[PDB]
Amino acid sequence: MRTHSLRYFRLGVSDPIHGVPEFISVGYVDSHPITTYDSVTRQAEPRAPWMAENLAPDHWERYTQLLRGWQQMFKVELKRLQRHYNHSGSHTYQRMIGCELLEDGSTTGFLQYAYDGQDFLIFNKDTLSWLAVDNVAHTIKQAWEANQHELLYQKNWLEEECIAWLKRFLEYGKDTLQRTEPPLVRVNRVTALFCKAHGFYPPEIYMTWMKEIVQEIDYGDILPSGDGTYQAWASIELDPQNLYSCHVEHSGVHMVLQVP
Amino acid sequence: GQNIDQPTEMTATEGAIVQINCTYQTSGFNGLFWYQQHAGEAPTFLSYNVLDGLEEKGRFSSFLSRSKGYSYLLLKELQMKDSASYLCAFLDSNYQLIWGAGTKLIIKPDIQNPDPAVYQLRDSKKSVCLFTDFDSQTNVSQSKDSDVYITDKCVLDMRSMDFKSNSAVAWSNDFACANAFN
Amino acid sequence: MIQRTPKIQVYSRHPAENGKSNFLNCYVSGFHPSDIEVDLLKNGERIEKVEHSSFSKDWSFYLLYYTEFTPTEKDEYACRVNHVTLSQPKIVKWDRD
Amino acid sequence: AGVTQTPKFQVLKTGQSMTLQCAQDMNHNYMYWYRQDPGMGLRLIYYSASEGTTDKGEVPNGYNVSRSTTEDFPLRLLSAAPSQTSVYFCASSNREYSPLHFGNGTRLTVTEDLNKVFPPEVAVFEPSEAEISHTQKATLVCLATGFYPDHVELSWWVNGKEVHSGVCTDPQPLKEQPALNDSRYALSSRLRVSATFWQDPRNHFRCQVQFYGLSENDEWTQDRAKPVTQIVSAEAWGRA
């Protein structure tokens, strides 16, 4: 029933203020971070106990060397982009790559870049093409599309390797990644009722009020509690002149709290 | 990244076709390469396959079967200059480049005038023997008397004359070019 | 470029009860660029013992900052954030209620 | 203009240090050192994913590298041993998954004793009258004998210009004594031409052997001339 995902994020900053990394890379399975690297440590490090226990030192030593390479490539690509835009000072380059494994077996994959936090280049692995936001991106896309070997490499990586990595990491983090922690839900009282849920995992939760759904409802965001679980809320105001109830849905289970 | 196999040596006739096979075993794959290495030269890149199917470029083709773990390099309209080693290699999941031991391709010229002859050349100031003009399916044996050197078989191509010839040389210092070979 | 000012939310890990070990969370999200300074404050003072954890589909950054703390009726906690979109550091007070 | 690797040939004494240079001006991030040994396939010694870093291959022992720049990846033998006798290939690649560009190789021999180094003797053997009258073709044979190590380039020069047409050269030298390892080597080549070409008294034939041996600042106390890097040639004129 659960869709799982593996995602890598890459951040490059030119002229970073003293101490701040020029380059950072973090991987995630779902919301759980699994790996980190930056230009300050210059070391690939696990970010889950189940990654440290199942991947030997030689894995981290190899991945360190790969990330030293990706850090240099980022610096060079960002410096070229700044030239193409006659930009100086600090500018941002971002890369995001990932796949999803669905319950049924179907997969998705994605790869995109941003310059200064705006879409730059988006890969379509089905048409083996790149969408480019502007002439500078278009010029780069056209060189990438002239290299059929690299496109086919990326499609195979997204569809086969990323998914094999995800399946390997799901097995390693089985007990953490596949668990359900059902929410604790309470109601508290300006004469408003707050429906408050916490201790839940995974983060996906639906919360509402009824009496007939209430239309004018404030929603708290799903926020991380820090201990691997999440919290959220839905509030309503009471017309002083009517029997109200909180409805929560989580991982296939429905909960109702009737308020007297 | 576990194993890779390709034949030691292959022999095909000028103007014909040859297929060099490569089998591999790995849990994790980022593409399979073919490289050409002329004797006394560096490997040069020929091809890259990562999905199933057939890539073509001039006289050369590369095929990959992911399920069978199997690639071939196909060379058409074979020339003498296609004599070289052909190396397959594949990237594993961590980008380890795993090299096969290489396949040596020998191109045999279509020789339509077998004239096996053993001659004696004098120094241009001590003397050597030349076994020449023999058929491409002759082997050049070797040497038992260890004070007598006999080179390997050698193919020269007098390109202006569309003429190809197998040659072998021997020397010593009682000797006689006759019997020198075989 | 386009700059995006951080969203700043301050909340406890567990429901708050005075004299009970809890964690103070400051979640900082939807900002650009990435350079940000976050401090948790006990009665106005920088807390030394503070930990932190990313970007979203829209390329904006997010971060959780937190400390072990024991709420009391007396003590007041806040999050202090500095970012290029901010003329002065933004302060959000923890609200138990 | 690709990957530049120097030198192309090197003899060392056991215990000497040596640096092989490799440069590429293609801005490739990955540089590699491999050794190639008969049967053994290509073995990775060291690689560098970028300037500022390096890491061991399959067989790093006895070798060292540095990556100060994108362009250069020097390979150091700190203490030459006989087991490091090999052919070394430098290579670069844009990324970890992109094709390798190779330098033209370093053939390195390590000997116990540089007094075993000998340049070749070269002789030209003129074509057999029997061959000319039976085939109306003329095979010259060049022989290069008594050289160590096996670091030679044999070429044929007809009227002062190099020729590839009609040339076959033994692809690997021969051992004059296959019992010894320090054994001196011999190499043969043929140049075949028309009888009319051989019989033309204007045609000049030169077998040339470039030998790779000692440098002019290697010390030398033997009676024979210092076996330095040098060309040895033999020649013949055609005749009617």
Kindly list the domain boundaries of chain C, sorted by start residue: 7-93
Give, to the nearest 10 degrees, the angle between helix A135-145 and helix A57-84. Answer: 130
Distance in Å, alpha carbon of B47 to nearest chain A alpha carbon: 9
Kindly list the residues from chain B whose CB atom is less than 8 angstroms away from the CB atom of residue D39: 101
Nearest residue, CB atoms, B51 vs list A63, A152, A165: A152
Instruction: Say which residue the tokens 């059902």 belong to.
Output: A182
Q: List the single best residue of A11, A36, A119, A190 to mutate versus C (max C Cβ within 10 A).
A: A11
Q: Which of D114, D124, D112 minimizes the C-alpha distance to D224?
A: D114
Residues of D in contact with A65 (CB under 8 A): 47, 49, 53, 55
Positive or negative: CA dihedral A165, A171, A174, A176: negative
**Best CA proximity match to D12, nearest among D103, D77, D66, D59:** D77
Q: Provide the 3-class DSSP secondary structure of residue B136.
A: coil
Resolution of the determined structure in angstroms stands at: 2.4
Residue numbers in B near D169 (CB within 8 A)? 154
* Kind of pairing between the strands at B9-13 and B103-108: parallel
Amino acid at A148: Q
Task: For chain A, list residues whose CB is within 8 angstroms of any CB belonging to chain B.
Answer: 59, 62-63, 66, 149, 152-153, 155-157, 160-161, 164-165
| Residue C52 in tokens | 């932190």
Give A70→chain D minimum CA distance, Å: 9
Residues D180, D159: contact at Cβ < 8 Å?
no
Residue B121 in contact with residue D130, Cβ under 8 Å?
A: no
In whole angstroms, give the CA distance from residue C95 to residue C12. 9
DSSP-derived secondary structure letter, C58: T
The answer to whether the peptide bond before residue D149 is cis (omega within 30 degrees of 0) is yes
SS3 C50: coil
Closest by CA position to D58, among listed D75, D74, D35: D35
Kindly report the backbone phi and psi dihedral angles of residue B34, in degrees, each rounded to the nearest multiple of 5, phi listed first: -115, 140
What are A23's two structure tokens? Answer: 């380059």
The interface residues of chain B toward chain D in range 106-135, judged by CB-CB distance below 8 A, are 115, 117, 119-128, 130, 132-133
Torsion, CA A73, CA A79, CA A85, CA A90, rounded to 10: 120
- Rounded Cα distance, D73 and D71, in Å: 7
Same domain, A209 and A96: no
Distance CA D57, CA A259 (A): 69
Distances (CA, A) of C81 to B71, C1, C2, C75, D220: 58, 21, 19, 20, 75
> CA–CA separation, A245 vs D17, rounded Å?
84
- CATH number of the domain encompassing residue A218: 2.60.40.10
Q: Quick count: other Cβ atoms within 10 Å of Cβ A68?
A: 26
Is-cis flag, bond preceding B109, omega within 30? no
Torsion of CA D160, D163, D168, D169, to 10 degrees: 50
Query: Which residues in chain A have Cβ-Cβ distances shorter than 8 Å to C14?
Result: 198, 225
Q: Are residues A150 and A208 in the same domain?
A: no
Query: What are the distances in angstroms from CA A70 to CA A51, A112, C57, D128?
Result: 21, 15, 21, 65
Under DSSP, is residue B129 helix (H, G, I), strand (E, B) or coil? strand
Query: Distance of alpha carbon B34 from its chain centroid, rounded?
Result: 15
CA distances from A223 to A48, B65, B145, C52 (A): 20, 47, 89, 14
Enumerate chain A positions whose Cβ falls within 8 A of a Cβ in C. Answer: 9, 11, 13, 16-17, 20, 26, 28, 33, 90-92, 94, 96, 114, 116-119, 186, 196, 198, 221, 223-227, 231
Contact present, D124 and D142 (Cβ < 8 Å): yes
Task: Give the pairing type, strands B127-132 and B117-123.
Answer: antiparallel
Q: Tell me the technique behind this structure.
A: X-ray
**Cα A202 to Cα A180: distance, rounded to the nearest angstrom:** 6
Residue numbers followed by a gap, chain B, C–N over 2.5 Å? 125, 173
Enumerate neighbours of B (3 or more CB pairs within 8 A).
A, D
Looking at the complex, report in whole angstroms how far the Cα of residue D90 sits from the nearest Cα belonging to chain B. 9
Q: Which residues does residue D154 pair with via DSSP β-bridges, in sequence order?
A: D209
Alpha-carbon distance of D4 to D104, in angstroms, equals: 7
CA–CA separation, D149 vs D9, rounded Å? 10
User: What residue type is assigned to position B54 of the chain?
Assistant: L
Q: How far is CA D148 from CA A179, B40, D54, D108, D229, in A?
A: 71, 18, 35, 12, 11
Q: Please choose, from the candidates B72, B80, B77, B59, the residue with its C-alpha nearest in 3D space to the C-alpha of residue B32.
A: B72
By the 10 Å C-beta count (0-12 exposed, 13-18 middle, 19+ buried), D213 is classed as buried
Q: What is the 3-state secondary structure (H, E, C) of chain D?
A: CCEEEECCEEEEECCCCEEEEEEECCCCCEEEEEEEECCCEEEEEEEECCCCCCEECCCCCCEEECCCCCCECCEEECCCCHHHCEEEEEEEECCCCCCCEECCCEEEEEECCHHHCECCEEEEEECCHHHHHHHCEEEEEEEEEEEECCCEEEEEEECCEEECCCEEECCCCEECCCCCCCCCEEEEEEEEEEHHHHCCCCCEEEEEEEECCECCCCCCCCCCCCCECEEEEEEEECCC
Q: Best mutation site among B47, B51, B54, B55 for testing chain A: the one with the most A CBs within 10 Å? A: B51
Q: In whole angstroms, what is the distance from residue D114 CA to residue D228 CA?
A: 11
- Alpha-carbon distance of B45 to B89, in angstroms, equals 11
Contacts of D59 in chain B (CB under 8 A): none
Contact A90, A103 (CB under 8 A): no
Q: Which CATH superfamily is domain C7-93 in?
A: Immunoglobulins (2.60.40.10)
SS (H, E, C) chain A: CCCEEEEEEEEEECCCCCCCCCEEEEEEECCEEEEEEECCCCCCEECCHHHHHHCCHHHHHHHHHHHHHHHHHHHHHHHHHHHHCCCCCCCEEEEEEEEEECCCCCEEEEEEEEECCEEEEEEECCCCEEEECCHHHHHHHHHHHCCHHHHHHHHHHHHHHHHHHHHHHHHHCHHHHCCCECCEEEEECCCEEEEEEEEEECCCCEEEEECCECCCCEECCCEECCCCCEEEEEEEECCCCCCCEEEEEECCEEEEEECC
Residue A65 touches chain D, beta carbons under 8 Å? yes
Give the contacts of A121 (CB within 8 A, at least 6 positions apart). A112, A113, A130, A131, A132, A133, A137, A140, A141
DSSP assignment letter at C55? B
Q: Which two tokens stand for residue D28?
A: 């490739």
User: Contact at 8 Å (CB) between A37 and A24?
Assistant: yes
- CA B54 to chain D, closest CA, distance in angstroms equals 18
C-beta atoms of D139 and B97 within 8 A: no
Tokens of A178: 């596949």
Cβ pair A155:B51 closer than 8 A:
yes
- Find the CB nearest B30 among A59, A62, A157: A157
B65 to chain D, closest Cα gap in Å: 19
Distance CA D114, CA D116 (A): 5
**A chain contacts of residue C57, beta-carbon cutoff 8 Å:** 96
What token pair was written down for B141? 């044996």
**Residue with tokens 């390109």, as numbered in its chain:** B159
Mark whether A32 and A142 lie in a shared domain: yes
Which pair of tokens denotes residue D137?
């073709």
**Is the pair B, D in contact (3+ CB pairs within 8 Å)?**
yes
Angle between helices A135-145 and A148-156 (to 10 degrees): 90
Of A20, A28, A224, the CB nearest to C64: A224
What is the sign of the dihedral through the CA atoms of B39, B45, B49 and B53?
negative
In angstroms, the CA B100 to CA D167 distance is: 31
For A81, the token pair is 């982009």
Cα separation, C47 vs C25, whole angstroms: 13
Nearest one of D73, D11, D3 to D44, comparing CA atoms: D73
Same domain flag for A246 and A120: no
Whether there are 3 or more C-beta pairs closer than 8 Å between C and D is no
Amino acid at A10: R
Pairwise CA distance, residues C46 & B65, whole Å: 62
Q: Domain ranges for chain D, please list them.
A: 1-112, 113-238
* Calpha distance B66→A156 (Å, rounded): 11
- With an 8 Å CB cutoff and a minimum of 3 pairs, decide whether chains A and D touch: yes
Asked if A153's CB is within 8 angstroms of B30's CB, the reply is yes
Strands B154-158 and B53-57: unpaired
Give the span between the Cα atoms of A202 and D46, in whole angstroms.
45
Decide: B and A in contact? Rule: 3+ Cβ pairs under 8 Å: yes
Mention every residue, 6+ apart, whose C-beta is less than 8 A from residue D3. Answer: D22, D23, D24, D90, D91, D92, D101, D102, D103
Whether the Cβ atoms of residue B58 and residue B79 lie closer than 8 Å to each other: no
For chain D, the maximum distance between any two Cα atoms, rounded to a whole number of angstroms, is: 68
Amino acid at position D126, single letter: E
| Interchain contact, A165 vs B31, CB within 8 Å | no
Tell me, yes or no, whether A165 and A201 share the same domain: no
Smallest CA–CA distance, residue A65 to chain B, in Å, is: 11
| Residues whose CB falls within 8 Å of the CB of residue C94, separated by 6 or more in sequence, listed in order | C10, C11, C12, C24, C76, C77, C78, C79
Cβ contact D50:D67 at 8 Å: yes
Q: What is the DSSP letter of B6?
A: -
Amino acid at site D46: Y
A71: chain D residues, CB-CB within 8 Å: 50
Torsion angle of C-alpha atoms A114, A116, A117, A122, degrees rounded to 10? -10
What residue type is D41 in one-letter code? G
Please name the residues in contact with D61: beta carbons below 8 A apart, sequence gap of 6 or more. Answer: none
CB contact under 8 A, D102 and B44: yes
D41 neighbourhood in chain B, CB within 8 Å? 99-102
Token code pair at residue B71: 């690639």
For CA atoms B73, B96, A96, A169, the dihedral sign is positive
Residue A121 lies in domain: 4-178
- Residue D87 tokens, joined: 């052919």
Q: Answer yes or no: do A100 and A209 share one domain.
A: no
Phi, psi of A62 (to 5 degrees): -65, -45
